[PDB]
Design a protein around this ligand. Structure first.
Ligand SMILES: CO[C@H]1O[C@H](CO)[C@@H](O)[C@H](O)[C@@H]1n1cc(-c2cccnc2)nn1
Ligand SMILES: [Ca+2]
Ligand SMILES: [Ca+2]
Ligand SMILES: [Ca+2]
Length: 132
């Protein structure tokens, strides 16, 4: 028994995969579903710091499963849960600014940025680990 599939990173009972290719946000959602996973939805501050650190070290602009597509300015996770007030701190300075209509959230440097949903970026999938 091993808790995660090969090349997946285990963290606090879940498995994480960072892509080595780039897609737009809607295709990133599909990419994760095809491996029985979900474009990463963040549930805790520890998990946030864990993901941002890898995004900073790798220096890769990376999609997360969050958008304000349904209502501009109200951010929602792809599993339907709302962005909580205790997560607003992770936006980068001056963000979210929706310049040129940016509806999808990404890891950018030390925090989050809203960027155009049609741009190709790396992504991270999340699924729960098996019990060994
Ligand atoms: C790399 O990050 C910058 O580019 C991202 C991609 O466009 C943005 O998503 C980020 O917000 C941020 N940004 C853009 C502007 C801006 C551009 C033109 C005129 N006025 C403001 N400000 N900050
Ligand atoms: Ca919009
Ligand atoms: Ca927006
Ligand atoms: Ca922005």
């Amino acid at each position: 028994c091993h808790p995660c599939p090969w090349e997946w990173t285990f963290f606090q009972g879940n498995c994480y995969f960072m892509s080595n290719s780039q897609r737009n946000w809607h295709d990133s959602i599909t990419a994760c579903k095809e491996v029985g996973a979900q474009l990463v939805v963040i549930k805790s501050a520890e998990e946030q710091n864990f993901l941002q650190l890898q995004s900073s070290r790798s220096n890769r602009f990376t999609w997360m499963g969050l958008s304000d597509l349904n209502q501009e300015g109200t951010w929602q996770w792809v599993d339907g849960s709302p962005l909580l007030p205790s997560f607003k701190q992770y936006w980068n300075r001056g963000e979210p600014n929706n310049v040129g209509e940016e509806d999808c959230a990404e890891f950018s440097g030390n925090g989050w940025n809203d960027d155009k949903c049609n741009l190709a970026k790396f992504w991270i999938c999340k699924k729960s680990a098996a019990s060994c």
